[PDB]
Nucleic acid binder design. Structure first.
Ligand SMILES: [Mg+2]
Ligand SMILES: [Mg+2]
Lengths: 239, 239
DNA sequence: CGCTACATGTCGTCC
DNA sequence: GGACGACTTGTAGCG
């Protein structure tokens, strides 16, 4: 029980309970391969008929059921649920949460494998090419937006909404930027347009919105043009 | 290669290679508990240092690296990626994707366990309490909105944007509905306000927007009132 | 906790 | 294929 991994194929009920319960109390990762039915009631409600899936219960409460396809678990519960194995006509893995109140029930018809992974990880993801990274590049070197641009505020509350960057231009105007790290879609324009209508109300018609992004969709460009907003092409930088 | 599950703890290199290549070829699920490093370059860029993780490869090319916390894999590749094992100074799992170009590299420093799960699942999820379900309700029972409300279109392309439900009211006004399955946000009122604007362009002052959802955030309420749009509290049905 | 907006979002789905 | 919007979205950042 200090070995990183413990594994049992075609486990007996005793062995199942032993590992399942040990991992939950040991703050370790539980992985299971089983034919199962799944029952979810919570924010929404779902039923999943009998079939083979991979099941993961992380020490933080995260509960995953993965089918042989997609990138998303077919069913899940997010970090913070309380999980318990429950012996019934079949074993039943049960995830409970109270805000919001949600129940996830996994019923194990046949467990092919149960396993305990006592995983030691002190390390964190270091990612670049984000919106945050664009915002940094614009404050270090405002030249990328345009000559004379002076950035002032990052993630600024206005009365309704939060603007990514608020600044001033060489004509002394108020400028709003909305940044997108990938091709900007319609809703980016709605955001930007919303912010700009709001500030025009205090500061006048001279306020400029600019959408900053590596490209636009057609609809983006269309609404951006209909509304008299602007576009500066900027790629998110990779450190 | 017949049994539903194969497990080899502390595999050797030939064992590792043998199992991984069987997995991929057989359209089984590959599961590896391992100490690894992860290198990602693609839409964005990252480096994950040495640590214990659960790696999954699904037969449709989904590639997941899970740490012992949260619901999201720390690194991942969506379906369609092409996976393979390469023998470098360490064995290295490699995920390539074209359109967009992405590389995901998982360097296996030490593999505690490796497993192949030849998994059979023919059943899909059946979910209720969605936005679709709300819309079906409104079409079966429009009086849930208001008496003398006639629905016409669902998920209808307006000039710019797609409206959720479009119809008329008893007084000859045009009615846009924006539906939400949970408490509505600023995002929701911006959507509504956009649609209502684009439709006033044509049919004039005869357009009403109605935001339909179980509740509203403060800001969404604030903004709703300001631009003079309306609200019907409605919960999605669970059937 | 509630609000706001990003994400390597992923995923269905209308033209 | 490109555009567009939902999702049990999850997740961080702030107040
Ligand atoms: Mg923003
Ligand atoms: Mg909508």
């Amino acid at each position: 029980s200090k070995d990183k991994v413990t594994v049992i194929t075609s486990p007996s009920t005793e062995e199942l309970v032993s590992l399942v319960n040990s991992a939950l109390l040991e703050e370790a990762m539980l992985t299971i391969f089983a034919r199962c039915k799944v029952h979810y009631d919570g924010r929404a409600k779902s039923e999943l008929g009998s079939g083979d899936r991979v099941i993961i219960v992380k020490p933080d409460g995260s509960f995953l059921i993965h089918q042989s396809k997609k990138r998303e678990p077919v069913n899940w519960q997010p970090p913070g649920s309380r999980v318990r194995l429950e012996l019934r006509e079949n074993p039943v893995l049960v995830s409970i949460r109270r805000k919001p109140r949600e129940t996830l029930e996994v019923e194990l018809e046949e467990v092919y494998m149960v396993s305990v992974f006592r995983a030691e990880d002190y390390e964190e993801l270091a990612l670049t090419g984000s919106e945050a990274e664009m915002a940094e590049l614009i404050f270090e070197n405002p030249e990328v937006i345009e000559p004379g641009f002076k950035p002032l505020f990052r993630e600024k509350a206005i009365g309704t909404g939060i603007v990514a960057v608020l600044g001033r231009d060489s004509d002394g105007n108020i400028v709003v930027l909305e940044l997108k790290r990938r091709r900007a879609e319609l809703h980016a324009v709605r955001q930007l347009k919303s912010y700009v209508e709001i500030l025009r109300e205090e500061y006048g018609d001279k306020v400029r919105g600019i959408l900053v992004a590596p490209s636009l969709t057609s609809g983006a460009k269309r609404l951006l043009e209909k509304e008299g907003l602007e576009f500066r092409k900027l790629e998110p930088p990779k450190r």
